[PDB]
């Protein structure tokens with residue numbers, strides 16, 4: 001029935017609202033110009049990053065990293081820091097997808113281990129336009145041009161994310177669309193090392209129906225939006241592997257030692 | 272509110288199950304006999320020790336050298352290596368404590384630096400009785416009388432931990448209880464060198480509330496269990512200073528030792 005599916009959508013949308021403070025609708029308002037006053041600090045070069053570093057830390061010692069370092073490395077350390085933060089919120093949201101917490105604990109951990117990245121890059125798209133990305137819970141805004149100009153390995157780092165966001169943001173999805181999408185990702189029965197594949201696919205199967213009904217109702221004028229959205233999941237799988245490859249060059253060719261015990265061991269045997 | 276507090280307990284218990292392979296329930300299964308996979312090998316003297324290592328026929332050891340040193344020192348190498356894994360386990364668990372990864376980064380490190388030893392002893396109690404301790408994932412069992420008999424410096428290393436364990440275990444706490452108690456330890460605002468005390472105390476306070484309710488509901492006949500458990504926090508703190516004092520003696524009585532890089536940071540200027 002339709003009402004069951006719609007009830008599952010409403011249910012997901014409210015968890016997602018509990019789990020993620022900066023939503024797409026809020027982020028989009030900020031990126032445009034809703035009630036222009038609390039404007040984010042715009043970082044567009046090195047000087048304005050240093051000037052900004054002391055306006056998201058000059059308050060009271062809470063940045064995404066301290067100093068005594070090269071700027072291209074510090075930006076990258078701040079991003080790994082935020083990712084660990086975002087893994088916690090994704091885990092919290094997962095627990096509220098019906099059926100998830102009744103899976104075998106190891107399969108829970110595996111699902112999260114490979115889902116988290118695709119979700120991070122999906123949701124990061126809500127903070128981006130073609131020119132930059134909202135940072136620090138929407139406090140800052142770092143321009144795509146500035147990220148591009150960092151040195152050889154750090155420059156080409158966030159570009160692929162921006163290439164994705166633009167094509168994905170053109171689907172015009174909202175938070176209620178994304179909440180299901182995100183849940184269809186977590187319950188991917190094709191992750192390596194999964195013990196019980198059948199029950200996961202039973203869940204995804206019921207989320208797919210929910211997604212499909214959601215898109216058909218919320219976006220009737222968009223022929224085959226469901227299909228296009230499932231195809232975007234190849235693009236995500238792609239950006240993850242390509243990010244994974246770039247990440248396995250950073251720890252390989254660099255001088256900075258300071259990586260999070262969580263990601264560095266969760267990146268282990270990962271595509 | 273009592274629902275969030277129960278939600279926090281199940282949350283922490285799951286992260287506990289996920290981070291620590293040898294739980295209290297399992298350890299007490301191996302100690303009890305209520306298991307289905309051979310009783311552990313008892314080590315009580317030099318010959319049973321010899322054999323317990325020489326038990327390499329269908330039973331393995333963890334990646335490093337073999338009999339490289341003296342007996343007393345080879346146990347010392349054994350525990351050291353296990354510490355490093357405990358630390359990694361504890362770190363993994365820490366990142367899942369609501370509000371921990373949002374903390375200033377230096378603060379995070381400080382909390383882990385001082386909290387780890389306390390958690391290592393609390394959880395080492397789970398594998399103890401008055402007679403000895405499970406070693407190497409509970410495949411082995413080394414007697415307290417054995418550990419007492421070692422050469423001067425080394426024979427006083429685990430005796431303090433034993434005395435604590437017998438009283439702690441009398442509290443009859445379970446894994447669901449330990450999970451919140453451990454979180455309370457890590458989020459301590461009196462660790463030297465912290466930069467944002469208040470946000471740490473706020474979390475502890477909420478964890479304190481959680482633990483109280485967990486104890487009331489899980490041990491309703493146990494009068495003042497909460498107080499009795501917080502009191503054990505001073506016993507633990509004494510174990511650590513004691514342990515760190517024994518390290519000093521090892522610098523004077525031993526030749527080349529030198530600790531694992533990770534452990535050496537955690538001990539650095541530690542009281």
Ligand SMILES: O=S(=O)(Nc1cc(-c2cccs2)nn1-c1ccc(F)cc1)c1cccc(F)c1
Pocket residue numbers: 343346347348350351352353354357391395418421425426428429432530534
């Ligand atoms: O915290 S410990 O008590 N540490 C410890 C005990 C011992 C020895 C016992 C008997 C002879 S030596 N050594 N260590 C130890 C741990 C870490 C270090 F960096 C140095 C010593 C311990 C004991 C058993 C298992 C553990 F995981 C930790």
